[PDB]
Amino acid sequence: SMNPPPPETSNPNKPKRQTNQLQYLLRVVLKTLWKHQFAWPFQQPVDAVKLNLPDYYKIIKTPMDMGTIKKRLENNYYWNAQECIQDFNTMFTNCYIYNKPGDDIVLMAEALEKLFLQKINELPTEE
């Protein structure tokens, strides 16, 4: 019934680098989604206690959200850009597992995901 702790966001044992694509993921991809009118359900871990969603963490075992992704980027948690992309994909997939078609949040997720995929199609040159 209780909320789990949030996902890890900083691990000093993981190696650290800044790359063209990671910069783009934070400063273009995440920034653009974050400022979108539909971002708010996705800006923090799902607080299933406060939202009265007792089954959320019974169903969703790999939670992910843009607040966590932002902190992971800021703490150099990801080495490869595709690790970050995978976390965005996990976030969207979770939404489509937990929520039903026609639910407002699904329309929101679909719009944000289409925007995400469009921005990923302009991923910049790798080192």
Binding site: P41, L51, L53, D55, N99, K100, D104, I105
Partner: peptide, 6 residues
């Protein structure tokens, strides 16, 4: 499961 948001 999360209700109206619009």
């Amino acid at each position: 499961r999360k209700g109206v948001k619009s």
